[PDB]
Design a protein around this ligand. Structure first.
Ligand SMILES: OC[C@H]1O[C@@H](O[C@H]2[C@H](O)[C@@H](O)[C@H](O)O[C@@H]2CO)[C@H](O)[C@@H](O)[C@@H]1O
Ligand SMILES: OC[C@H]1O[C@@H](O)[C@H](O)[C@@H](O)[C@@H]1O
Length: 298
């Protein structure tokens, strides 16, 4: 009894019933128009596809107003310590101008409750980024994971790191994100939060352990995590509080929009906004397809 199930999200409407739909202007300043559940359902942005829960974006109409239509779901329930396991058949692709993310956010004013980016990236990225964003006074050790450490200071305004880079670790598997991830039918991302740290495992389709989807997973016997955040350089218990789960896909903005001109999407249009507004068909691959989402507690 290392871990026991405390919250199974099910699928379809039962799944959406466990989330609040965020409709405010995008905090990351993207060219996105977050819509309500009713509007999303009416636009085909959410639903069920052969038993899997679907969440995508508008890939039909030229954009206007705040931006291209999408959804941002934040869980009603919160968890302080536990294991979050998501099994995906598909995630938003490596589409130019997009910025998808499956993550967790603490309670209170950001970043004081902590933030965990489990699946995140922008534009035509190949590798997934796993990152923590915290208040000042939190750095991680460089060992215990298979990914490549990019930044060690989790403080959102860490000196010497781009603003809000946080402490990030990049996966080494090309199938850990977008295009590659979808070509193999997805996989599973398991995230463990304890008073001693946070760990994130990525199991590409077919390589998951026998208990990962069961009622009593035991991360202790799993292969090395893709990312591990720990060490005496952080008060792990105090830096993170009750976390809510979030699904979203924004466009351009602080990250995707800012790096548009230096990457491979630069040739698609002079600016990210122009591309996102005038090329609806380009975003057909920008959707999540969830097999299951289950949360466990020690
Ligand atoms: O990862 C390097 C990249 O970080 C960018 O900051 C992102 C951060 O990576 C992401 O985890 C967070 O959710 O959003 C911030 C931006 O607000 C940074 O903007 C890039 O310049 C940098 O290359
Ligand atoms: O949405 C969670 C937080 O994300 C951060 O990137 C933004 O800067 C905050 O304004 C926001 O509250």
């Amino acid at each position: 009894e290392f871990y026991h199930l405390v919250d199974d999200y099910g699928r379809g409407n039962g799944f959406f019933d466990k989330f609040n739909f965020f409709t405010g202007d995008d905090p990351t300043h993207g060219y996105v128009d977050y819509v309500s559940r009713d509007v999303a359902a009416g636009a085909g942005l959410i639903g069920e596809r052969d038993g899997r829960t679907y969440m995508g974006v508008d890939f039909t109409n030229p954009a206007s107003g705040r931006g291209r239509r999408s959804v941002r779901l934040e869980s009603k329930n919160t968890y302080e310590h536990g294991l979050i396991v998501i099994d995906l058949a598909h995630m938003p692709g490596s589409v130019c101008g997009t910025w998808p993310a499956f993550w967790t956010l603490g309670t209170g004013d950001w970043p004081y409750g902590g933030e965990i980016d489990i699946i995140e990236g922008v534009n035509d990225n190949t590798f997934n980024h796993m990152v923590l964003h915290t208040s000042d006074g939190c750095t991680i050790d460089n060992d215990g994971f298979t990914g490549n450490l990019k930044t060690s200071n989790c403080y959102v305004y860490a000196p010497g790191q781009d603003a809000n880079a946080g402490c990030g670790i990049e996966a080494t598997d090309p199938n850990s994100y977008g295009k590659g991830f979808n070509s193999i039918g997805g996989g599973i991302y398991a995230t463990e939060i304890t008073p001693n740290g946070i760990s994130i495992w990525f199991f590409p389709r077919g390589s998951e352990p026998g208990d990962v989807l069961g009622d009593n997973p035991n991360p202790a016997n799993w292969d090395t995590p893709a990312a591990k955040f720990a060490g005496g350089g952080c008060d792990w218990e105090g830096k993170f509080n009750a976390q809510r789960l979030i699904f979203d896909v924004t466009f351009c903005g602080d990250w995707a929009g800012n790096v548009w001109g230096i990457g491979g999407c630069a040739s698609r249009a002079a600016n990210c906004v122009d591309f996102v507004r005038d090329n609806p068909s380009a975003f057909a691959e920008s959707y999540w397809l969830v097999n299951s989402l289950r949360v466990y507690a020690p």
